[PDB]
Amino acid sequence: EMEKEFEQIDKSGSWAAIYQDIRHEASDFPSRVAKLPKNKNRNRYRDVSPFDHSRIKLHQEDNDYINASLIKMEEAQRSYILTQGPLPNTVGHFWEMVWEQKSRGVVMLNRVMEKGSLKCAQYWPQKEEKEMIFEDTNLKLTLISEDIKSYYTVRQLELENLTTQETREILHFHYTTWPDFGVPESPASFLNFLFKVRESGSLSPEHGPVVVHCSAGIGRSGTFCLADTCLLLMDKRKDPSSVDIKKVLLEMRKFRMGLIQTADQLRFSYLAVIEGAKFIM
């Protein structure tokens, strides 16, 4: 059981060691499309690339590339799109992807500014009366409502395909309190946030995959997917303690490189799953 494995690694201070074994066992697949010279300005970080096999393709004949991966968890029956925080020049691609994949929710785990630098473009409207038009992808986005809470904000957005005049409601879940350094002290507000996204229906199979991002789409984004998938597997299985976090993480790393960036994020992921298991048992 992971609770005992937690005490062991913690008492022995072995987190950096476990983390390095995960790094060494992780899959390595080609990312040729990401490295094409025509795609250099579509990537926020030169060392964070989607694998070719799991990359999301845009349905635009010109250039189909976005820094985004489909993570398919077959046993849990959950999919996720993990992506980088959009760049000034990829905001239109981001919303085209949301439209094409039939996503109902966007999960944002970063602030636009952290450590005095921009981690993400402002890709949604700040006021009801000031909608955004993406001329490159023929989409209009309107803020419908905004509910600001202590630890997160939920926004209802309307996305309109200007080509077909179809409209969809998108939910934006913005976790606003992840600290600039390290991880939250307690996983309580992160679990509350994760249950709110679940309650919305955004993670349900009647919709396209949820879009999850931070700045690179691998660290905080990884922690979100890892916790959700592990808690779902503990519901589904005859023996809940058959769930090995390390194995789940390695299965997810087949789909996008580098998920969980530090030994602190790994420790935090264990704590979130262990605590979340109390609310699920």
PDB file of C-alpha atoms in Angstrom:
ATOM      1  CA  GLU A   1       0.000   0.000   0.000  1.00  0.00           C
ATOM      2  CA  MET A   2       1.205   3.489  -1.127  1.00  0.00           C
ATOM      3  CA  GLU A   3       0.633   5.100   2.357  1.00  0.00           C
ATOM      4  CA  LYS A   4       3.369   2.763   3.762  1.00  0.00           C
ATOM      5  CA  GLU A   5       5.555   3.254   0.624  1.00  0.00           C
ATOM      6  CA  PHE A   6       5.116   7.060   1.281  1.00  0.00           C
ATOM      7  CA  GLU A   7       6.359   6.810   4.941  1.00  0.00           C
ATOM      8  CA  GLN A   8       9.309   4.597   3.751  1.00  0.00           C
ATOM      9  CA  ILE A   9      10.501   7.009   0.976  1.00  0.00           C
ATOM     10  CA  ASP A  10       9.802  10.014   3.289  1.00  0.00           C
ATOM     11  CA  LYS A  11      11.554   8.569   6.428  1.00  0.00           C
ATOM     12  CA  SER A  12      14.501   7.384   4.200  1.00  0.00           C
ATOM     13  CA  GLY A  13      14.405  10.743   2.197  1.00  0.00           C
ATOM     14  CA  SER A  14      14.528   8.672  -1.093  1.00  0.00           C
ATOM     15  CA  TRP A  15      12.282  10.978  -3.300  1.00  0.00           C
ATOM     16  CA  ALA A  16      15.165  12.183  -5.570  1.00  0.00           C
ATOM     17  CA  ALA A  17      16.158   8.479  -6.009  1.00  0.00           C
ATOM     18  CA  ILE A  18      12.619   7.170  -6.927  1.00  0.00           C
ATOM     19  CA  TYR A  19      12.299  10.204  -9.254  1.00  0.00           C
ATOM     20  CA  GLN A  20      15.609   9.335 -11.064  1.00  0.00           C
ATOM     21  CA  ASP A  21      14.463   5.673 -11.556  1.00  0.00           C
ATOM     22  CA  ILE A  22      11.277   7.032 -13.263  1.00  0.00           C
ATOM     23  CA  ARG A  23      13.433   9.350 -15.460  1.00  0.00           C
ATOM     24  CA  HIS A  24      15.633   6.352 -16.492  1.00  0.00           C
ATOM     25  CA  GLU A  25      12.668   3.935 -17.188  1.00  0.00           C
ATOM     26  CA  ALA A  26      10.639   6.574 -19.172  1.00  0.00           C
ATOM     27  CA  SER A  27       9.779   5.992 -22.864  1.00  0.00           C
ATOM     28  CA  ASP A  28      11.566   7.910 -25.621  1.00  0.00           C
ATOM     29  CA  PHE A  29       9.703   8.218 -28.938  1.00  0.00           C
ATOM     30  CA  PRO A  30      10.442  10.385 -31.953  1.00  0.00           C
ATOM     31  CA  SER A  31       9.217  14.028 -32.035  1.00  0.00           C
ATOM     32  CA  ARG A  32      10.231  14.802 -35.640  1.00  0.00           C
ATOM     33  CA  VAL A  33       7.235  17.035 -36.436  1.00  0.00           C
ATOM     34  CA  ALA A  34       7.905  19.291 -33.353  1.00  0.00           C
ATOM     35  CA  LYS A  35      11.578  19.822 -34.468  1.00  0.00           C
ATOM     36  CA  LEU A  36      10.764  20.964 -38.064  1.00  0.00           C
ATOM     37  CA  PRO A  37      12.110  24.511 -38.593  1.00  0.00           C
ATOM     38  CA  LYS A  38       8.635  25.799 -39.657  1.00  0.00           C
ATOM     39  CA  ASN A  39       7.373  24.794 -36.115  1.00  0.00           C
ATOM     40  CA  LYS A  40      10.121  26.521 -34.041  1.00  0.00           C
ATOM     41  CA  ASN A  41       7.846  29.481 -33.104  1.00  0.00           C
ATOM     42  CA  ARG A  42       4.924  27.082 -32.178  1.00  0.00           C
ATOM     43  CA  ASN A  43       6.971  25.714 -29.188  1.00  0.00           C
ATOM     44  CA  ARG A  44       7.378  27.639 -25.924  1.00  0.00           C
ATOM     45  CA  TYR A  45      10.379  25.451 -24.759  1.00  0.00           C
ATOM     46  CA  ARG A  46      12.874  23.790 -27.170  1.00  0.00           C
ATOM     47  CA  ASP A  47      13.241  20.697 -24.845  1.00  0.00           C
ATOM     48  CA  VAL A  48       9.415  20.014 -24.478  1.00  0.00           C
ATOM     49  CA  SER A  49       7.966  18.341 -27.544  1.00  0.00           C
ATOM     50  CA  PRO A  50       4.977  16.107 -28.177  1.00  0.00           C
ATOM     51  CA  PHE A  51       5.838  12.629 -29.503  1.00  0.00           C
ATOM     52  CA  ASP A  52       4.734  12.170 -33.127  1.00  0.00           C
ATOM     53  CA  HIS A  53       2.561   9.141 -32.264  1.00  0.00           C
ATOM     54  CA  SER A  54       0.297  10.913 -29.705  1.00  0.00           C
ATOM     55  CA  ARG A  55       0.435  14.548 -30.967  1.00  0.00           C
ATOM     56  CA  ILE A  56      -2.872  16.397 -31.609  1.00  0.00           C
ATOM     57  CA  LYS A  57      -3.212  17.452 -35.254  1.00  0.00           C
ATOM     58  CA  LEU A  58      -5.020  20.661 -36.218  1.00  0.00           C
ATOM     59  CA  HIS A  59      -7.453  20.185 -39.199  1.00  0.00           C
ATOM     60  CA  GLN A  60      -5.850  23.148 -41.164  1.00  0.00           C
ATOM     61  CA  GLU A  61      -4.191  21.959 -44.451  1.00  0.00           C
ATOM     62  CA  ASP A  62      -1.303  24.483 -44.150  1.00  0.00           C
ATOM     63  CA  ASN A  63       0.421  23.470 -40.832  1.00  0.00           C
ATOM     64  CA  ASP A  64      -1.309  20.885 -38.563  1.00  0.00           C
ATOM     65  CA  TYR A  65       1.145  21.324 -35.659  1.00  0.00           C
ATOM     66  CA  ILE A  66       0.383  22.282 -32.029  1.00  0.00           C
ATOM     67  CA  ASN A  67       2.391  21.433 -28.936  1.00  0.00           C
ATOM     68  CA  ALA A  68      -0.291  19.118 -27.482  1.00  0.00           C
ATOM     69  CA  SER A  69      -0.472  15.383 -26.682  1.00  0.00           C
ATOM     70  CA  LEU A  70      -3.394  12.935 -26.238  1.00  0.00           C
ATOM     71  CA  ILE A  71      -2.962  10.845 -23.048  1.00  0.00           C
ATOM     72  CA  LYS A  72      -5.277   7.769 -23.349  1.00  0.00           C
ATOM     73  CA  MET A  73      -5.697   5.794 -20.050  1.00  0.00           C
ATOM     74  CA  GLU A  74      -7.439   2.640 -21.407  1.00  0.00           C
ATOM     75  CA  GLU A  75      -8.222   0.940 -18.054  1.00  0.00           C
ATOM     76  CA  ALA A  76      -9.521   4.175 -16.408  1.00  0.00           C
ATOM     77  CA  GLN A  77     -11.519   5.138 -19.577  1.00  0.00           C
ATOM     78  CA  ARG A  78     -10.099   8.699 -19.265  1.00  0.00           C
ATOM     79  CA  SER A  79      -8.437  10.805 -21.986  1.00  0.00           C
ATOM     80  CA  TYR A  80      -6.660  14.179 -21.538  1.00  0.00           C
ATOM     81  CA  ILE A  81      -5.048  16.631 -23.925  1.00  0.00           C
ATOM     82  CA  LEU A  82      -1.926  18.102 -22.267  1.00  0.00           C
ATOM     83  CA  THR A  83      -0.597  21.252 -23.959  1.00  0.00           C
ATOM     84  CA  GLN A  84       1.722  24.188 -23.265  1.00  0.00           C
ATOM     85  CA  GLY A  85       0.391  27.583 -22.236  1.00  0.00           C
ATOM     86  CA  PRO A  86      -0.457  29.225 -25.585  1.00  0.00           C
ATOM     87  CA  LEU A  87       1.936  31.741 -27.130  1.00  0.00           C
ATOM     88  CA  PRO A  88       0.797  35.093 -28.603  1.00  0.00           C
ATOM     89  CA  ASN A  89       0.922  33.499 -32.068  1.00  0.00           C
ATOM     90  CA  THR A  90      -0.792  30.163 -31.086  1.00  0.00           C
ATOM     91  CA  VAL A  91      -3.911  31.454 -29.197  1.00  0.00           C
ATOM     92  CA  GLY A  92      -5.982  30.849 -32.362  1.00  0.00           C
ATOM     93  CA  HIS A  93      -4.534  27.301 -32.744  1.00  0.00           C
ATOM     94  CA  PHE A  94      -5.380  26.574 -29.073  1.00  0.00           C
ATOM     95  CA  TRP A  95      -9.083  27.405 -29.560  1.00  0.00           C
ATOM     96  CA  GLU A  96      -9.161  25.596 -32.948  1.00  0.00           C
ATOM     97  CA  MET A  97      -7.937  22.462 -31.077  1.00  0.00           C
ATOM     98  CA  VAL A  98     -10.633  22.928 -28.369  1.00  0.00           C
ATOM     99  CA  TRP A  99     -13.256  23.241 -31.150  1.00  0.00           C
ATOM    100  CA  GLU A 100     -11.979  20.261 -33.245  1.00  0.00           C
ATOM    101  CA  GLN A 101     -11.565  17.858 -30.269  1.00  0.00           C
ATOM    102  CA  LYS A 102     -15.102  18.707 -28.826  1.00  0.00           C
ATOM    103  CA  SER A 103     -13.604  19.508 -25.418  1.00  0.00           C
ATOM    104  CA  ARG A 104     -16.054  20.832 -22.739  1.00  0.00           C
ATOM    105  CA  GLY A 105     -13.387  22.020 -20.222  1.00  0.00           C
ATOM    106  CA  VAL A 106     -10.001  23.786 -20.119  1.00  0.00           C
ATOM    107  CA  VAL A 107      -7.947  23.301 -16.935  1.00  0.00           C
ATOM    108  CA  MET A 108      -5.286  26.032 -16.342  1.00  0.00           C
ATOM    109  CA  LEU A 109      -2.839  25.419 -13.476  1.00  0.00           C
ATOM    110  CA  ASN A 110      -0.609  28.528 -13.831  1.00  0.00           C
ATOM    111  CA  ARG A 111      -0.898  32.360 -13.566  1.00  0.00           C
ATOM    112  CA  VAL A 112      -0.218  34.435 -16.689  1.00  0.00           C
ATOM    113  CA  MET A 113       2.752  35.943 -14.841  1.00  0.00           C
ATOM    114  CA  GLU A 114       4.947  33.998 -12.428  1.00  0.00           C
ATOM    115  CA  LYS A 115       8.483  34.813 -11.137  1.00  0.00           C
ATOM    116  CA  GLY A 116       8.167  38.164 -12.994  1.00  0.00           C
ATOM    117  CA  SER A 117       7.915  36.531 -16.521  1.00  0.00           C
ATOM    118  CA  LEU A 118       4.976  35.654 -18.822  1.00  0.00           C
ATOM    119  CA  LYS A 119       4.213  31.906 -18.588  1.00  0.00           C
ATOM    120  CA  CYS A 120       1.182  32.075 -20.943  1.00  0.00           C
ATOM    121  CA  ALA A 121      -0.666  34.490 -23.304  1.00  0.00           C
ATOM    122  CA  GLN A 122      -3.951  35.964 -22.006  1.00  0.00           C
ATOM    123  CA  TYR A 123      -6.090  33.695 -24.273  1.00  0.00           C
ATOM    124  CA  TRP A 124      -9.586  34.449 -22.827  1.00  0.00           C
ATOM    125  CA  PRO A 125     -11.607  37.697 -22.464  1.00  0.00           C
ATOM    126  CA  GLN A 126     -11.444  39.689 -19.219  1.00  0.00           C
ATOM    127  CA  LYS A 127     -14.874  41.347 -19.646  1.00  0.00           C
ATOM    128  CA  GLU A 128     -18.309  40.287 -20.956  1.00  0.00           C
ATOM    129  CA  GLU A 129     -18.530  43.225 -23.406  1.00  0.00           C
ATOM    130  CA  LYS A 130     -14.981  42.747 -24.922  1.00  0.00           C
ATOM    131  CA  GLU A 131     -15.087  39.452 -26.876  1.00  0.00           C
ATOM    132  CA  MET A 132     -11.984  38.100 -28.732  1.00  0.00           C
ATOM    133  CA  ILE A 133     -11.920  37.247 -32.443  1.00  0.00           C
ATOM    134  CA  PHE A 134      -9.173  34.872 -33.734  1.00  0.00           C
ATOM    135  CA  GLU A 135      -8.946  35.895 -37.419  1.00  0.00           C
ATOM    136  CA  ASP A 136      -6.460  33.076 -38.319  1.00  0.00           C
ATOM    137  CA  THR A 137      -8.938  30.319 -37.146  1.00  0.00           C
ATOM    138  CA  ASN A 138     -12.358  32.044 -37.625  1.00  0.00           C
ATOM    139  CA  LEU A 139     -13.460  31.697 -33.974  1.00  0.00           C
ATOM    140  CA  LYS A 140     -15.062  34.140 -31.565  1.00  0.00           C
ATOM    141  CA  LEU A 141     -14.817  33.761 -27.783  1.00  0.00           C
ATOM    142  CA  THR A 142     -17.067  35.575 -25.244  1.00  0.00           C
ATOM    143  CA  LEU A 143     -16.912  35.617 -21.455  1.00  0.00           C
ATOM    144  CA  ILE A 144     -20.464  34.684 -20.202  1.00  0.00           C
ATOM    145  CA  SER A 145     -19.750  34.555 -16.441  1.00  0.00           C
ATOM    146  CA  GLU A 146     -16.885  34.337 -13.985  1.00  0.00           C
ATOM    147  CA  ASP A 147     -17.040  32.895 -10.449  1.00  0.00           C
ATOM    148  CA  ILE A 148     -13.921  33.919  -8.437  1.00  0.00           C
ATOM    149  CA  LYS A 149     -13.165  31.810  -5.317  1.00  0.00           C
ATOM    150  CA  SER A 150     -10.231  31.817  -2.889  1.00  0.00           C
ATOM    151  CA  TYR A 151      -8.138  29.075  -4.625  1.00  0.00           C
ATOM    152  CA  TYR A 152      -9.636  28.973  -8.189  1.00  0.00           C
ATOM    153  CA  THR A 153     -11.863  30.761 -10.701  1.00  0.00           C
ATOM    154  CA  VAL A 154     -14.438  29.103 -12.991  1.00  0.00           C
ATOM    155  CA  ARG A 155     -15.435  30.908 -16.154  1.00  0.00           C
ATOM    156  CA  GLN A 156     -18.259  30.039 -18.590  1.00  0.00           C
ATOM    157  CA  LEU A 157     -17.177  30.917 -22.159  1.00  0.00           C
ATOM    158  CA  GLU A 158     -19.013  30.788 -25.455  1.00  0.00           C
ATOM    159  CA  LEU A 159     -16.941  29.654 -28.433  1.00  0.00           C
ATOM    160  CA  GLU A 160     -18.516  30.387 -31.817  1.00  0.00           C
ATOM    161  CA  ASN A 161     -17.387  28.955 -35.151  1.00  0.00           C
ATOM    162  CA  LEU A 162     -17.752  32.054 -37.381  1.00  0.00           C
ATOM    163  CA  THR A 163     -17.658  29.713 -40.468  1.00  0.00           C
ATOM    164  CA  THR A 164     -20.811  27.719 -39.417  1.00  0.00           C
ATOM    165  CA  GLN A 165     -22.290  29.980 -36.665  1.00  0.00           C
ATOM    166  CA  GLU A 166     -22.339  26.922 -34.311  1.00  0.00           C
ATOM    167  CA  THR A 167     -21.673  27.825 -30.638  1.00  0.00           C
ATOM    168  CA  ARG A 168     -20.537  25.757 -27.643  1.00  0.00           C
ATOM    169  CA  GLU A 169     -20.206  26.492 -23.982  1.00  0.00           C
ATOM    170  CA  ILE A 170     -16.628  25.872 -22.665  1.00  0.00           C
ATOM    171  CA  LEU A 171     -15.836  25.805 -18.927  1.00  0.00           C
ATOM    172  CA  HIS A 172     -12.473  27.359 -17.894  1.00  0.00           C
ATOM    173  CA  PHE A 173     -11.154  26.021 -14.562  1.00  0.00           C
ATOM    174  CA  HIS A 174      -8.277  28.225 -13.390  1.00  0.00           C
ATOM    175  CA  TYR A 175      -6.330  27.080 -10.326  1.00  0.00           C
ATOM    176  CA  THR A 176      -4.866  30.441  -9.211  1.00  0.00           C
ATOM    177  CA  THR A 177      -2.933  29.558  -5.994  1.00  0.00           C
ATOM    178  CA  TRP A 178      -0.179  27.142  -7.022  1.00  0.00           C
ATOM    179  CA  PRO A 179       2.908  28.816  -5.458  1.00  0.00           C
ATOM    180  CA  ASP A 180       5.716  30.312  -7.688  1.00  0.00           C
ATOM    181  CA  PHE A 181       8.187  27.830  -6.037  1.00  0.00           C
ATOM    182  CA  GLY A 182       7.593  24.249  -4.872  1.00  0.00           C
ATOM    183  CA  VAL A 183       4.137  22.676  -4.398  1.00  0.00           C
ATOM    184  CA  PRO A 184       1.168  23.475  -2.105  1.00  0.00           C
ATOM    185  CA  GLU A 185       1.761  22.486   1.586  1.00  0.00           C
ATOM    186  CA  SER A 186      -1.634  20.652   1.701  1.00  0.00           C
ATOM    187  CA  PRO A 187      -3.387  18.896  -1.243  1.00  0.00           C
ATOM    188  CA  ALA A 188      -6.826  19.878   0.125  1.00  0.00           C
ATOM    189  CA  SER A 189      -7.524  22.833  -2.227  1.00  0.00           C
ATOM    190  CA  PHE A 190      -6.089  20.934  -5.254  1.00  0.00           C
ATOM    191  CA  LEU A 191      -8.451  17.943  -4.513  1.00  0.00           C
ATOM    192  CA  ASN A 192     -11.413  20.328  -4.086  1.00  0.00           C
ATOM    193  CA  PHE A 193     -10.490  21.801  -7.504  1.00  0.00           C
ATOM    194  CA  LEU A 194     -10.159  18.321  -9.101  1.00  0.00           C
ATOM    195  CA  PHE A 195     -13.641  17.306  -7.713  1.00  0.00           C
ATOM    196  CA  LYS A 196     -15.091  20.536  -9.104  1.00  0.00           C
ATOM    197  CA  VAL A 197     -13.764  19.727 -12.573  1.00  0.00           C
ATOM    198  CA  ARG A 198     -15.191  16.169 -12.273  1.00  0.00           C
ATOM    199  CA  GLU A 199     -18.587  17.510 -11.101  1.00  0.00           C
ATOM    200  CA  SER A 200     -18.838  19.738 -14.203  1.00  0.00           C
ATOM    201  CA  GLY A 201     -18.932  16.737 -16.567  1.00  0.00           C
ATOM    202  CA  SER A 202     -15.753  18.013 -18.353  1.00  0.00           C
ATOM    203  CA  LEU A 203     -13.929  14.646 -17.753  1.00  0.00           C
ATOM    204  CA  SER A 204     -16.882  12.538 -18.934  1.00  0.00           C
ATOM    205  CA  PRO A 205     -16.839  10.261 -21.998  1.00  0.00           C
ATOM    206  CA  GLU A 206     -19.841  12.094 -23.593  1.00  0.00           C
ATOM    207  CA  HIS A 207     -17.351  14.957 -24.355  1.00  0.00           C
ATOM    208  CA  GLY A 208     -13.992  15.268 -26.096  1.00  0.00           C
ATOM    209  CA  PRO A 209     -10.941  15.131 -23.836  1.00  0.00           C
ATOM    210  CA  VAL A 210     -10.345  17.906 -21.315  1.00  0.00           C
ATOM    211  CA  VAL A 211      -7.510  20.304 -22.233  1.00  0.00           C
ATOM    212  CA  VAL A 212      -5.019  20.675 -19.354  1.00  0.00           C
ATOM    213  CA  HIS A 213      -2.099  23.124 -19.335  1.00  0.00           C
ATOM    214  CA  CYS A 214       0.439  24.931 -17.184  1.00  0.00           C
ATOM    215  CA  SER A 215       3.421  26.684 -18.851  1.00  0.00           C
ATOM    216  CA  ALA A 216       5.137  23.606 -20.407  1.00  0.00           C
ATOM    217  CA  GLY A 217       2.177  21.178 -20.038  1.00  0.00           C
ATOM    218  CA  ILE A 218       4.246  18.511 -18.158  1.00  0.00           C
ATOM    219  CA  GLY A 219       4.664  19.455 -14.446  1.00  0.00           C
ATOM    220  CA  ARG A 220       1.524  20.711 -12.695  1.00  0.00           C
ATOM    221  CA  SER A 221      -0.506  19.338 -15.689  1.00  0.00           C
ATOM    222  CA  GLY A 222       1.070  15.916 -15.009  1.00  0.00           C
ATOM    223  CA  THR A 223       0.092  16.063 -11.294  1.00  0.00           C
ATOM    224  CA  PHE A 224      -3.555  16.801 -12.247  1.00  0.00           C
ATOM    225  CA  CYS A 225      -3.911  13.814 -14.678  1.00  0.00           C
ATOM    226  CA  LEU A 226      -1.904  11.438 -12.434  1.00  0.00           C
ATOM    227  CA  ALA A 227      -4.137  12.151  -9.370  1.00  0.00           C
ATOM    228  CA  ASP A 228      -7.411  11.907 -11.359  1.00  0.00           C
ATOM    229  CA  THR A 229      -6.430   8.577 -13.091  1.00  0.00           C
ATOM    230  CA  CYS A 230      -5.094   6.958  -9.851  1.00  0.00           C
ATOM    231  CA  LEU A 231      -8.289   7.845  -7.871  1.00  0.00           C
ATOM    232  CA  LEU A 232     -10.517   6.539 -10.726  1.00  0.00           C
ATOM    233  CA  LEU A 233      -8.545   3.211 -10.845  1.00  0.00           C
ATOM    234  CA  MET A 234      -9.003   2.834  -7.017  1.00  0.00           C
ATOM    235  CA  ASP A 235     -12.806   3.109  -7.588  1.00  0.00           C
ATOM    236  CA  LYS A 236     -12.813   0.597 -10.453  1.00  0.00           C
ATOM    237  CA  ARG A 237     -10.555  -2.200  -9.082  1.00  0.00           C
ATOM    238  CA  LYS A 238     -11.513  -5.173  -6.824  1.00  0.00           C
ATOM    239  CA  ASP A 239      -8.326  -4.357  -4.797  1.00  0.00           C
ATOM    240  CA  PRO A 240      -7.737  -0.546  -4.529  1.00  0.00           C
ATOM    241  CA  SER A 241      -4.108  -0.974  -3.204  1.00  0.00           C
ATOM    242  CA  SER A 242      -3.179  -2.759  -6.486  1.00  0.00           C
ATOM    243  CA  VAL A 243      -2.742   0.857  -7.825  1.00  0.00           C
ATOM    244  CA  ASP A 244       0.978   1.672  -8.277  1.00  0.00           C
ATOM    245  CA  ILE A 245       1.445   5.469  -8.851  1.00  0.00           C
ATOM    246  CA  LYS A 246       4.922   4.868 -10.397  1.00  0.00           C
ATOM    247  CA  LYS A 247       3.480   2.442 -12.989  1.00  0.00           C
ATOM    248  CA  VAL A 248       0.596   4.813 -13.821  1.00  0.00           C
ATOM    249  CA  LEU A 249       3.091   7.685 -14.293  1.00  0.00           C
ATOM    250  CA  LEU A 250       5.262   5.540 -16.609  1.00  0.00           C
ATOM    251  CA  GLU A 251       2.173   4.559 -18.681  1.00  0.00           C
ATOM    252  CA  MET A 252       1.298   8.303 -18.990  1.00  0.00           C
ATOM    253  CA  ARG A 253       4.929   9.132 -20.019  1.00  0.00           C
ATOM    254  CA  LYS A 254       4.432   6.907 -23.109  1.00  0.00           C
ATOM    255  CA  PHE A 255       2.153   9.731 -24.386  1.00  0.00           C
ATOM    256  CA  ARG A 256       4.016  12.898 -23.361  1.00  0.00           C
ATOM    257  CA  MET A 257       7.587  13.307 -22.104  1.00  0.00           C
ATOM    258  CA  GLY A 258       8.574  14.659 -18.714  1.00  0.00           C
ATOM    259  CA  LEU A 259       5.248  14.442 -16.878  1.00  0.00           C
ATOM    260  CA  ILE A 260       6.027  15.384 -13.213  1.00  0.00           C
ATOM    261  CA  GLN A 261       9.082  17.684 -13.372  1.00  0.00           C
ATOM    262  CA  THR A 262      10.520  17.442  -9.809  1.00  0.00           C
ATOM    263  CA  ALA A 263      10.709  14.967  -6.880  1.00  0.00           C
ATOM    264  CA  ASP A 264       8.528  17.479  -4.973  1.00  0.00           C
ATOM    265  CA  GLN A 265       5.728  17.154  -7.576  1.00  0.00           C
ATOM    266  CA  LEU A 266       6.051  13.314  -7.254  1.00  0.00           C
ATOM    267  CA  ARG A 267       5.761  13.504  -3.415  1.00  0.00           C
ATOM    268  CA  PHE A 268       2.795  15.926  -3.807  1.00  0.00           C
ATOM    269  CA  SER A 269       1.082  13.477  -6.282  1.00  0.00           C
ATOM    270  CA  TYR A 270       1.379  10.640  -3.699  1.00  0.00           C
ATOM    271  CA  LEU A 271      -0.086  12.916  -0.951  1.00  0.00           C
ATOM    272  CA  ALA A 272      -2.967  14.011  -3.226  1.00  0.00           C
ATOM    273  CA  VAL A 273      -3.881  10.380  -4.132  1.00  0.00           C
ATOM    274  CA  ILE A 274      -3.495   9.156  -0.472  1.00  0.00           C
ATOM    275  CA  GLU A 275      -5.689  12.033   0.842  1.00  0.00           C
ATOM    276  CA  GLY A 276      -8.166  11.732  -2.038  1.00  0.00           C
ATOM    277  CA  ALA A 277      -8.540   7.949  -1.278  1.00  0.00           C
ATOM    278  CA  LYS A 278     -10.029   8.905   2.192  1.00  0.00           C
ATOM    279  CA  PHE A 279     -12.869  10.854   0.386  1.00  0.00           C
ATOM    280  CA  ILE A 280     -13.271   7.743  -1.942  1.00  0.00           C
ATOM    281  CA  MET A 281     -13.221   4.954   0.790  1.00  0.00           C
TER     282      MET A 281
END
